[PDB]
Amino acid sequence: HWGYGKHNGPEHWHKDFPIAKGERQSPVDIDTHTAKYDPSLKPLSVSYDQATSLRILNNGHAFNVEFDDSDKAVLKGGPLDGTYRLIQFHFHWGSLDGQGSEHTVDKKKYAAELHLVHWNTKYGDFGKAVQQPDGLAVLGIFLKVGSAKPGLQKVVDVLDSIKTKGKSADFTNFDPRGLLPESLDYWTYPGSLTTPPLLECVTWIVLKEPISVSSEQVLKFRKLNFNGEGEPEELMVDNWRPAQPLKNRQIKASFK
């Protein structure tokens, strides 16, 4: 079963998922001396007021918060056509503050990265959406260690109750607006799922401004287990895929 270790990690993925060496694989390094400011890029339209969080789950790769995708949390605008519905969010993080993000900015690795996953509604269901180049829009947001993020506290406090693979808790009344920074300045490029099946169905939208999270908050991420309860203890850390080659895609910025 795929994972992040020496024996099942990103370097083994191409064997079951040959697309791993594709033309638009994610994440990528965002090189700012090559990123193209695009004045035509619209401001992002995040509408999360109606988001209906359901539960949080430890899937053995990370923990993910599922939403009711009817409920009308939607991402639109920015570089996107049509309506993308929020279906879930999750994080990738490191074994120390100095790494854990998937995207990098001039090779800088952040402590973590939040991904808010949305799907294009012309495709009827998530499953069909992922089979299309414009099937998904993932909003990526970096995490740096600093002051606490109040909107994160419910997430981290619940982690104690979902330590091992397959564990879930109820997670109603979670407002994902609280995971957002001040600015919605962004980079964007066509990419992929950063986990298997690595499908090239994603319009990546990566925010310029990281959110500040406390050391106390990020530490809780590192107490999760990859393994199931009663299995050999595998700590859930460094669950990130390294930056992939851009292969001459244009990363467009909405700010200079």
Ligand X SMILES: COc1cc2c(cc1O)CC[C@@H]1[C@@H]2CC[C@]2(C)[C@@H](OS(N)(=O)=O)CC[C@@H]12
By CB under 6 A, the residues from 5 to 64 that bind ligand X are 57, 59, 64
Dihedral sign for Cα 188, 204, 154, 94, please. Answer: negative
Parallel, antiparallel, or unpaired: how do β-strands 202-207 and 136-145 relate? parallel
Does 138 participate in binding ligand X (rule CB under 6 A)? yes
- Residues with active-site annotation: 61
Region binding ligand X by CB under 6 A among candidate stretches 72-80, 122-130, 159-167, 217-225: 122-130
CA atoms within 13 A on the CB side of 26: 29
Distance CA 2, CA 199 (A): 15
Both tokens of 70, joined, read 């009817």
Of 17-25, 124-132, 163-171, 211-219, which segment contacts ligand X by CB under 6 A?
Answer: 124-132
Whether residue 65 contacts residue 89, with contact meaning beta carbons closer than 8 Å, is answered with yes
Each residue 172-211 as x (binds ligand X by CB under 6 A) or -, in order, gives ---------------------xxx-x--------------
Q: Does residue 236 belong to the site contacting ligand X (CB under 6 A)?
A: no
User: Segment 59-118, which members bind Zn ion (CB under 5 A)?
Assistant: 115
Q: Which residues pair with 114 in a beta bridge?
A: 91, 141
Strand-pairing partners, residue 96, are none
CB of 33 to ligand X, least distance (A): 26
Which residue sits closest to ligand X, CB atoms considered?
127
